[PDB]
Design a protein around this nucleic acid. Structure first.
Ligand code: CL
Ligand code: MG
Ligand code: MG
Ligand code: NA
Ligand code: NA
Length: 274
DNA sequence: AAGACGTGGAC
DNA sequence: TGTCCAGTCT
């Protein structure tokens, strides 16, 4: 058999993936890839990252862009709050940080859309600085290798082992190896993350509130100035064309109130504008 | 904490 | 080929 760090390093060399956002120095380009990767497959991110970088090449450029343009670029990646939080982070850094991202984990975690994993990822991948980077692939490796016989294991139990095994001067290459080995394990054995205490599944997407959330934002993006009642008519048309029934008035008004509060579009009179 | 929050790639 | 599943925030 093989000790843990040697299994990871050798597997990482065997499995290395030459992804476009790897081995970059620009923390902003790395941040965009990491936000895009949250709960989203590498192959999808590959279809968006280069295009997004071309349209918004810097923190300052993303800050200056219209929110509608950023949302348009995001459509299809899902979990669209990420687009707003990423743009907000750019706006904060443009106005307060001279157009640059911070270079400590704590300061990165203070920014919208950047939790512990994205913060550690930016520090490791952009700055080659060590930290605890625990996402689905790393979780899978540690569950498979160090918790082989355990039915359910919390991230609390994994955290000290991820911390202890991160090399001081090689974090970027180490976490690429964990990412690549984890994705491999997810293909060749029963997904080890099923033994995570936090393993869950979402509600049915068809007919769901979040399906309507995403449609409503697309309808407003497509039609600046759309009236509030017209928006309801168009949502109902989409639902019926998809085979579902009309949306009840309470649900329509509640979802729209949520989307305005979150910043996807604004109300001007009775009309909506992204 | 648990649970809200998209949707397309792999099999 | 319908099912599984690829972090942040409160
Ligand atoms: Cl729902
Ligand atoms: Mg944050
Ligand atoms: Mg589904
Ligand atoms: Na713009
Ligand atoms: Na598998």
């Amino acid at each position: 058999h093989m000790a843990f760090v040697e299994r990871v390093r050798t597997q990482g060399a065997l499995l290395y993936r030459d992804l476009p956002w790897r081995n970059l120095d620009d923390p902003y380009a790395v941040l965009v890839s990491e936000v895009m990767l949250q709960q989203t497959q590498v192959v999808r991110v590959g279809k968006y990252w280069n295009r997004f970088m071309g349209m918004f090449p810097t923190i300052d450029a993303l800050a200056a862009a219209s929110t509608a343009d950023v949302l348009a670029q995001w459509q299809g990646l899902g979990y669209n709050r990420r687009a707003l939080a990423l743009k907000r982070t750019a706006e904060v850094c443009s106005a307060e940080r001279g157009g640059t991202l911070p270079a400590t984990n704590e300061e990165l975690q203070a920014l919208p859309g950047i939790g512990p994993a994205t913060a550690a990822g930016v520090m490791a991948f952009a700055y080659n600085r060590p930290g605890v980077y625990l996402e689905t692939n790393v979780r899978t490796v540690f569950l498979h290798e160090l918790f082989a016989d355990r039915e359910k294991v919390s991230d609390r139990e994994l955290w000290p082992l991820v911390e202890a095994t991160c090399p001081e001067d090689d974090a970027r290459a180490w976490y690429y190896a964990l990412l690549d080995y984890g994705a491999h394990l997810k293909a060749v054995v029963a997904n080890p993350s099923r033994r995570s205490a936090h393993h869950t599944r979402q509600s049915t997407f068809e007919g769901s509130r979040r399906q309507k959330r995403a449609e409503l934002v697309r309808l407003v993006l497509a039609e600046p100035g759309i009236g509030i009642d017209e928006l309801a008519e168009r949502l109902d048309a989409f639902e019926r064309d998809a085979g579902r029934k009309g949306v009840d008035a309470a649900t329509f008004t509640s979802i729209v109130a949520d989307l305005v509060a979150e910043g996807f579009f604004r109300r001007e009179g009775d009309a909506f504008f992204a």
